[PDB]
Symmetry: D2
Subunit: 297 residues, 4 copies
């Protein structure tokens, strides 16, 4: 029951702190390139071990051998004036170094791709690894939907555990709120598109004010790693291949409700969406693919 | 943060033991008529370390300034005499003994609740989930109406995390538990723990529980059945009020089946 | 990760309900002779959603490949026939029926444990803590020996977070609970939950529980009393073996008080 | 039940993340000076609210009005070649700005001083605030003792909840392991001084590799804020005034086991230590005071 977290930056550390505050790890491996930092981060985590429950750090990937779950957070320092594409591609070449050394020592692990753009990069992981579809997952929209549910529940006077809606598509501006599935404790609403804009926007102001997301995406990967490790068979909107749904014909990844357990994705839901909804998801994949098409793997 | 459970039957204790494991009570109080049993206080008081409630008191006026009262026997004007509070009726039939609880107390409707179909909805949800092959927290659906064989499933709002006979297996399986035992202790204590949490910690969660429903679904008399209610610090805060006709008339049939006018107030 | 509790008495169920609230079992099994009660399975099986264990099975060979066996009646060669596992004896008197459990089974000493003074030490610790005015987790002290009026306090190791009659109040208060009730259900279920946790999750925590003690404190015969034991995945892993004479002779007096040679193996 | 955290750096954020992962806060206020960062940090925390339970950020201290607990983490960028003293003094003048504005809007709050040197600075807080002794606490040795207990428990084959020892004195190199109180589940050991050096050393390599401690000290303040807010009457080694113990005659703060609840410190233990132990604590205060004596408040 070993877990590896590649990249000990703000995301990885917040991922790893959330994985530690959850019983989930027997072993925890942290990986990056600045040795002085890897050690300092593992030593800070194990100075407070009495309050946690679990730690390794280093540069060589043999440390990761036989990880049950490998969370990938490593990204690239984004330049200003750089385009979305040159950004993606630098993160594709970084993956051209990571995923080989992950499969190399853990051919059976579950891959969880957190780094961005997560949809495109979960496709790169699938292609570089050759792993089946079940063992390649992306953080996707799990946080998006969670934030969506919370804000709507706050507009109503109810607890978020009793409000149920989700956001599918690209994890980004072209995501899609599925308003036909909104529910309150067994009651369909038909018995709010602004909240959705607040989420994708709020997610943009953060990256602008602070550079990245760390705390929120760390909790969400905690929500996800919990279902996989402990095999809860829980449902999360996460990036898997949807070629063959909503008319799409390319090998596009994006978030659709999946059931997560020991083996990764146990099945992919095939949603029956409204006309409009099915169109927006098709446009969402048109957006992703209009960029995925131009990457050199 | 005082809590009272009246009736140390097998239920009132399952309710007690479940309200103590959820660590809700600063002061739990057990009242009943036979004392030599009551003085059950000393057992709970002996695994105290394994619990998280400093005070456990039993006897036969000790319920003063309580914020929640669970009735399980087996009463009220003496609860209100010292606990004028939220009273949650667990005794059966819950739909009817909650009409009595509110008339005999004069409390508003927010402070008079019944267990109702909170347990029935929980069990129903599990089985559908154990059937699809997904964790029960991600499948959502409620059964409303009477706590009994007339309850109604709401197929118009089944949901798997924002999406779109098993019933009779839940009401039938409740019978076998009465026959094979007589009383139902462990399961109702959980559902009462689940409810007591939202009430005490003001979670404002939605539970199908018994309160006034006249005005909904074409009912014309003061019946209390399980409607999805927003439970919190102040008892009930809002009541959700409109589904398929196939089911709304099922809700009057279940109110029709709901003995009301055959006892004296 | 299968767990078995034999004897659906009031204890075996408090033990069951407490082992399910700590969410330890992938598969809980209840065995006993009278079936119409046994088929208590359906209540626990009805608040399933409020628990975290997919399987609850009762009957009269179903205990196969179990990792823990709690004996509470009210047996063994049939536990071992299918569960050759850790057996934790809760039946009374625990000090003696754990000698029987190990001889009749042939298990090594690590896989034969008794509740013993784990509950007695927990309650004792609370009262001293409620007396000083500090949280019970920060005061540490155990009572060893026989589960009864002969147990020994270890004043030579009382501690408040690394520092330096209440006893008789704990053993006396155990009597009143038998008289006023007959059985002790809720409190022993907690102590058995506390123990079952370390065992199942391999916490390697230290609990005063019943195992072989001949060799310690000048005892000369095969008596099992409560010694501080390191409980884990494999049952007992180490046994802590030397305190004031005032107290070590108290440990033989408690073993002296320990009926042994008056029943047939 | 409001909690304020002054300083939204690595310590404060790790403090605040640990306060949030614990039910403890109704309101949570974050405070510093870089507006662009305060907002970005509060927006990252409230994007993952569904997984937490509670948030404010800003520069003006009126936000903090009537805080039940005010955690102070703000420190100064330590220069190289700067001496321990010029360092302390810059953190004293920073406190000359903080503590007035804390008392100004929350005259009844509990002060928890985390910034370093915590012992000296808890004395500065007491003097600047005029608050009684119970409402001025310092993180002190709570983490030190916790780490001590864990490492020793790991050398034995037991769980840390069944090993009990503590470290008192300066939170630093002159701290003192009280070996006379070591215990295992009701048994005194007399029925290891190396672990202590590993802790104070490990705490130094961290500051060198990473600049600061964040994760560990964030958990420890979580352990502390839990007892105060929820009023557990729990015992922690924390910086309070010890003038009148172990021969000390100056108004020196340092960690001695205290009972913590709604009102802060409910009582201060008066330990009965071995000869040696009582000497080291006297030397530990000699060390602290050899620096406290030279600060200008």
């Amino acid at each position: 029951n070993k877990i590896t977290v590649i990249g000990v930056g703000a995301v990885g550390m917040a991922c790893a702190f959330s994985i530690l505050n959850k019983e989930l790890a027997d072993e925890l491996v942290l990986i990056d390139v600045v040795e002085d930092k890897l050690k300092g981060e593992m030593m800070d985590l194990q100075q407070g071990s009495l309050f946690l429950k679990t730690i390794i750090a280093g540069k060589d990937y043999e440390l990761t051998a036989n990880s049950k779950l490998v969370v990938v957070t490593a990204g690239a320092r984004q330049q200003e004036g750089e385009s979305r594409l040159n950004l993606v591609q630098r993160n594709v070449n970084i993956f051209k170094f990571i995923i080989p050394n992950v499969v190399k020592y853990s051919p059976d692990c579950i891959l969880l791709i957190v780094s961005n753009p997560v949809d495109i990069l979960t496709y790169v992981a699938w292609k570089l690894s050759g792993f089946p579809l079940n063992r390649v997952i992306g953080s996707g929209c799990n946080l998006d939907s969670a934030r969506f549910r919370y804000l709507v529940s706050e507009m109503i006077g109810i607890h978020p555990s009793n409000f149920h809606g989700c956001i599918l598509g690209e994890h980004g501006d072209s995501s899609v709120p599925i308003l036909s599935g909104l529910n309150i404790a067994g009651m369909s609403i038909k018995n709010c598109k602004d909240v959705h804009k607040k989420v994708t926007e709020s997610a943009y102001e953060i990256i602008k004010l602070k550079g990245y997301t760390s705390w929120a995406i760390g909790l969400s990967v905690g929500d996800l790693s919990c279902s996989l490790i402990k095999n809860l068979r829980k449902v999360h909107p996460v990036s898997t291949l949807v070629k063959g749904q909503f008319g799409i014909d390319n090998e596009v990844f994006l978030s659709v409700p999946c059931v997560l357990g020991r083996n990764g994705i146990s099945e992919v839901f095939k949603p029956k969406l409204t006309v409009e909804e099915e169109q927006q998801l098709k446009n969402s994949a048109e957006t992703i693919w209009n960029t995925q098409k131009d990457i050199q793997l």
